[PDB]
């Protein structure tokens, strides 16, 4: 589970740190990734890429 720090709170996703780093580059055009609000995988969410502050590498 990869931990992402947003402006409001913290969310988790399946994708690895390299993939999220690739999604944060200027040349890409996608803007959404899949993840969960809690580490228990109870409620699914759709995350906007541009709202990520930093990745807990």
């Amino acid at each position: 589970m990869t931990k992402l720090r947003l402006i409001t709170g913290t969310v988790y996703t399946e994708m690895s740190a390299a993939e999220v780093r690739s999604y944060l580059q200027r040349g890409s055009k996608a803007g959404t990734i899949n993840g969960y609000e809690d580490e228990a995988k109870t409620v699914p969410i759709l995350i906007s890429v541009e709202s990520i502050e930093y990745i807990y590498l």
Binding site: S22, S28, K29, A30
Partner: protein, 52 residues
């Protein structure tokens, strides 16, 4: 697109011919698992074709 030759009873030769969906090597398959097709998959497919 959707041909298949081994459709005779017992798995014997039928009347149709094998299509693209069968002649393609099973190794060169990228499964999207029911998601949307994005921009990143084109480069992966191109790399798969180029390495051969």
């Amino acid at each position: 697109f959707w041909g298949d030759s081994k459709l005779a009873p017992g798995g014997q030769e039928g009347l149709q011919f094998d299509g693209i969906n069968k002649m393609i090597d099973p190794e060169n398959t990228i499964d999207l698992k029911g998601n949307y097709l994005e921009e990143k998959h084109i480069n992966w497919g191109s790399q798969l074709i180029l390495q051969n």
